[PDB]
Amino acid sequence: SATQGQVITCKAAVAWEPNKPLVIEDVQVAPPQAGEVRVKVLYTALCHTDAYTWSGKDPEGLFPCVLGHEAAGIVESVGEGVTEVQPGDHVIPCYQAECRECKFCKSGKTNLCGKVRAATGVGVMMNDRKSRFSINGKPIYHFMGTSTFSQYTVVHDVSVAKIDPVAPLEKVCLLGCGVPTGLGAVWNTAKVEPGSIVAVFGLGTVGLAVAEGAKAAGASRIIGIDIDSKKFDRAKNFGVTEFINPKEHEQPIQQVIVDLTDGGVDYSFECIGNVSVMRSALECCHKGWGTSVIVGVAASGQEISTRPFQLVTGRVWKGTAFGGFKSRSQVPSLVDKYLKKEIKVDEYITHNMTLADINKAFDLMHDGDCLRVVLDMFV
Amino acid sequence: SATQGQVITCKAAVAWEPNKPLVIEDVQVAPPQAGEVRVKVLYTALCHTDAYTWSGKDPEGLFPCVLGHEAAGIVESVGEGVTEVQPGDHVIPCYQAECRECKFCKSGKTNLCGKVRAATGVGVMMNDRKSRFSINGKPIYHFMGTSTFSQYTVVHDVSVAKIDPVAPLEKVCLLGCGVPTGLGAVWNTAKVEPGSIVAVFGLGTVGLAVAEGAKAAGASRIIGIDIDSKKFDRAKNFGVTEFINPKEHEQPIQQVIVDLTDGGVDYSFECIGNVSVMRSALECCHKGWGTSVIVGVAASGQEISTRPFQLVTGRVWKGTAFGGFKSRSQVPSLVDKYLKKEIKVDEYITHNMTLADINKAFDLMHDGDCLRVVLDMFV
Numbered sequence: 001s002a003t004q005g006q007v008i009t010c011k012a013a014v015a016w017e018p019n020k021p022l023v024i025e026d027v028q029v030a031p032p033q034a035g036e037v038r039v040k041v042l043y044t045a046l047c048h049t050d051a052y053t054w055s056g057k058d059p060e061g062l063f064p065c066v067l068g069h070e071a072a073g074i075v076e077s078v079g080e081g082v083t084e085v086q087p088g089d090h091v092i093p094c095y096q097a098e099c100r101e102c103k104f105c106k107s108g109k110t111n112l113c114g115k116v117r118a119a120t121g122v123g124v125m126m127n128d129r130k131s132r133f134s135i136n137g138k139p140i141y142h143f144m145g146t147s148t149f150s151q152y153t154v155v156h157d158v159s160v161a162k163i164d165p166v167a168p169l170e171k172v173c174l175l176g177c178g179v180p181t182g183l184g185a186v187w188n189t190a191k192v193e194p195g196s197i198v199a200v201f202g203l204g205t206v207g208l209a210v211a212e213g214a215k216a217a218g219a220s221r222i223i224g225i226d227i228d229s230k231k232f233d234r235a236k237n238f239g240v241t242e243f244i245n246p247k248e249h250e251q252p253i254q255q256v257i258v259d260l261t262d263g264g265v266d267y268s269f270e271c272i273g274n275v276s277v278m279r280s281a282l283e284c285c286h287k288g289w290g291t292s293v294i295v296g297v298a299a300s301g302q303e304i305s306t307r308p309f310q311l312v313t314g315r316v317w318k319g320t321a322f323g324g325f326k327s328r329s330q331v332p333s334l335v336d337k338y339l340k341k342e343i344k345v346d347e348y349i350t351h352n353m354t355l356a357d358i359n360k361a362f363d364l365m366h367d368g369d370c371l372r373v374v375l376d377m378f379v
Numbered sequence: 380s381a382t383q384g385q386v387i388t389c390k391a392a393v394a395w396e397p398n399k400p401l402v403i404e405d406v407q408v409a410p411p412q413a414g415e416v417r418v419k420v421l422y423t424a425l426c427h428t429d430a431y432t433w434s435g436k437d438p439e440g441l442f443p444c445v446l447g448h449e450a451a452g453i454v455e456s457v458g459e460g461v462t463e464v465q466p467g468d469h470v471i472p473c474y475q476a477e478c479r480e481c482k483f484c485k486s487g488k489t490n491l492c493g494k495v496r497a498a499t500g501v502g503v504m505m506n507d508r509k510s511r512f513s514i515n516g517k518p519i520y521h522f523m524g525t526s527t528f529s530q531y532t533v534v535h536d537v538s539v540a541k542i543d544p545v546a547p548l549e550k551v552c553l554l555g556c557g558v559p560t561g562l563g564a565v566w567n568t569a570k571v572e573p574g575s576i577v578a579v580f581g582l583g584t585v586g587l588a589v590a591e592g593a594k595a596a597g598a599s600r601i602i603g604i605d606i607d608s609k610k611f612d613r614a615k616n617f618g619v620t621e622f623i624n625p626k627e628h629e630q631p632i633q634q635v636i637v638d639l640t641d642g643g644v645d646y647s648f649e650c651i652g653n654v655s656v657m658r659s660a661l662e663c664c665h666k667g668w669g670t671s672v673i674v675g676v677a678a679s680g681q682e683i684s685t686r687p688f689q690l691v692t693g694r695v696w697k698g699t700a701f702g703g704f705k706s707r708s709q710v711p712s713l714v715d716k717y718l719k720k721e722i723k724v725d726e727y728i729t730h731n732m733t734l735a736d737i738n739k740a741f742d743l744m745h746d747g748d749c750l751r752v753v754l755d756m757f758v
């Protein structure tokens with residue numbers, strides 16, 4: 001190819017400082033080293049995770065950085081010893097790695113591979129503990145091991161899911177975050193049985209995928225809870241059967257739910273990242289067997305609380321990370337399901353913009369009057 | 380019989396008011412009404428649950444009352460419509476009912492039958508919403524639906540486990556509380572797999588039964604944690620393989636455990652009823668799959684807390700109520716395990732005294748070195 005083994009110069013949205021507009025820059029992208037993959041990022045979506053770090057409220061935040069973690073693209077080059085992917089392969093770079101060999105991958109009880117976490121957590125690559133991005137010979141931090149706000153990114157091979165090349169890249173970029181998180185919270189983490197009564201707190205992309213997962217599981221009732229009643233109508237198509245706006249009830253939300261379900265739900269899913277709501281989601285579960293799954297990522301430092309009698313009396317408290325899906329092994333299977341029209345993906349995208357419109361997409365996300373916004377990186 | 384249909388006059392340890400010595404009184408015990416069983420209580424054990432109410436720390440505490448909830452005896456008479464038990468049957472009255480036909484009993488996902496809780500919780504019988512005990516025509520409240528500190532008690536038939544008549548009643552009185560709670564926390568709630576690594580917080584009767592359950596489950600390591608190192612030696616016989624005294628380490632106990640178990644335990648069991656230790660028990664669990672079971676009953680109003688990242692990263696928080704055992708269906712099965720020498724019971728009894736020694740027995744329990752104290756009711 002033209003770029004193989006060479007430093008690439010491309011466009012990237014750089015966050016020089018927290019809480020300031022992103023700046024589209026020309027960046028240098030170093031070639032991939034051993035166990036690395038350089039990806040042409042065709043489309044990137046954005047989510048609250050990108051905004052949390054950009055805001056300056058993330059203690060793990062490192063500036064200047066290239067944000068972004070939901071993307072689909074094409075392998076431009078591979079580093080030494082890469083064999084699962086080759087140039088030209090269609091891929092989804094994932095924030096959750098799957099080395100297949102560690103304690104976690106070989107456990108059979110989790111998807112939390114820790115192989116590259118010490119490097120990705122500090123915005124660098126494992127091979128040399130340095131970033132592959134630079135502006136004027138000065139490094140720019142990676143983010144979540146993905147950095148999808150760059151036209152070309154360098155990621156660890158263990159994070160690269162190889163997907164069907166016929167799959168639309170402007171759609172499947174969602175399968176690296178929200179959609180599998182929501183579906184897997186139901187299918188892998190909770191393991192929702194047919195006939196279950198489900199409560200979904202937060203009717204955004206994540207809560208809507210939980211609703212779709214619970215509908216595929218054959219839940220008898222899917223109760224949708226949101227503080228914005230305008231989000232109720234779009235929710236019906238994702239499987240939500242009933243709605244509650246907590247602002248319309250003086251009594252605690254858990255009490256409303258308990259009153260409507262003869263003691264509480266079989267499964268609840270908190271899809272917001274609000275510690276108060278996480279307690280309510282636990283407490284709205286039925287005595288004896290009710291299970292609350294935390295999906296929402298709460299701001300660092302915040303605590304969840306309840307009275308232990310809640311768990312002594314049969315309620316279970318758990319959480320999910322990427323819906324318990326193993327990235328390399330299972331993300332391709334989700335793309336296959338989507339192609340066979342077995343799962344929805346397109347319905348979670350409300351807007352399509354271009355890389356130059358990054359700030360406008362973040363403002364729209366900040367308004368909260370959209371679902372996923374997909375950006376075309378090469379307009 | 381001599382007493383069938385008649386009011387019995389017998390000895391009972393009465394708690395007239397909180398935090399005062401119990402008085403051995405002559406009480407009138409009314410005959411059983413519909414769905415009731417009058418039991419000759421041959422032996423009663425004492426536990427922290429009797430002391431919590433006695434001390435006046437229980438806001439649900441009603442005085443004057445007949446305390447006691449761990450006993451074994453013989454059916455003296457039955458009320459109309461009672462068919463599972465007959466006069467002369469050997470029985471264990473249980474604080475947890477099993478009606479076999481409610482939402483909970485049928486569900487197949489819990490042992491928390493709610494049939495008689497409304498009446499037992501207020502120290503009365505369901506049939507007429509009054510007590511069967513009186514002194515000078517004045518009522519004395521029941522306790523836990525059991526009131527085992529009386530030579531004769533009246534209990535709901537749904538709380539009566541029928542047991543093998545050869546089982547020694549001075550030993551099996553323990554199978555109505557502590558021992559099944561510990562064993563079941565492992566076998567039923569956690570469902571501990573062979574080779575697991577277990578942490579047990581609190582090495583009293585309950586923690587020791589957890590250790591025995593975990594050892595029977597094939598746990599590879601059983602780490603016992605107690606603030607009193609004198610409790611370590613006796614714990615080895617119960618299956619505890621290693622010990623930690625939190626007072627001997629400046630680092631939080633969960634860190635000490637993580638450091639000894641390559642990331643944390645597979646299962647932890649809190650057997651104290653201390654909210655701060657409950658948090659440590661959750662946090663000492665391994666990322667991805669570690670499960671913590673709350674066994675200890677905390678003081679009313681106390682809250683448990685953690686950071687939600689602990690659950691999002693794969694730890695599970697649950698609790699147990701009577702070890703998930705169904706009283707009428709499974710307590711006889713535990714009596715059978717004891718008679719097969721499959722489970723220990725004798726080993727948790729450090730003292731045998733008489734009903735007249737009740738206050739001496741509570742004093743011993745307050746000192747907190749003893750395990751179970753068994754009282755001979757008819758001496």
Ligand SMILES: NC(=O)c1ccc[n+]([C@@H]2O[C@H](COP(=O)([O-])OP(=O)(O)OC[C@H]3O[C@@H](n4cnc5c(N)ncnc54)[C@H](O)[C@@H]3O)[C@@H](O)[C@H]2O)c1
Pocket residue numbers: 047048049177178181201202203204205206207225226227228231246271272273274277294295296297298320321322323368370371691
């Ligand atoms: N665990 C994981 O692996 C993982 C992965 C991806 C995303 N997430 C988390 O999922 C959450 C949701 O993401 P999203 O993209 O769907 O967000 P979103 O902004 O589209 O949706 C959140 C919804 O919650 C609603 N809401 C806010 N406060 C509320 C309250 N008090 N009660 C009820 N509803 C309320 C909002 O109106 C909105 O509809 C975030 O917290 C994100 O961190 C977790």
Ligand SMILES: NC(=O)c1ccc[n+]([C@@H]2O[C@H](COP(=O)([O-])OP(=O)(O)OC[C@H]3O[C@@H](n4cnc5c(N)ncnc54)[C@H](O)[C@@H]3O)[C@@H](O)[C@H]2O)c1
Pocket residue numbers: 312426427428556557560580581582583584585586604605606607610625650651652653656673674675676677699700701702747750
């Ligand atoms: N969930 C149920 O169904 C159920 C049923 C019966 C009993 N229980 C609970 O079991 C608990 C234990 O009962 P028990 O009879 O074994 O009590 P116990 O007094 O015999 O044992 C408690 C132990 O905890 C230890 N301890 C106290 N503080 C400690 C700390 N900070 N760290 C470590 N160890 C500490 C004490 O030294 C003691 O050895 C009680 O809280 C009781 O409510 C629960």
Ligand SMILES: [Zn+2]
Pocket residue numbers: 046047048049069070177178
């Ligand atoms: Zn995302």
Ligand SMILES: [Zn+2]
Pocket residue numbers: 097098099100101102103104105112113114115
């Ligand atoms: Zn791995």
Ligand SMILES: [Zn+2]
Pocket residue numbers: 425426427428448449556557
């Ligand atoms: Zn007890």
Ligand SMILES: [Zn+2]
Pocket residue numbers: 476477478479480481482483484485491492493494
């Ligand atoms: Zn029942």
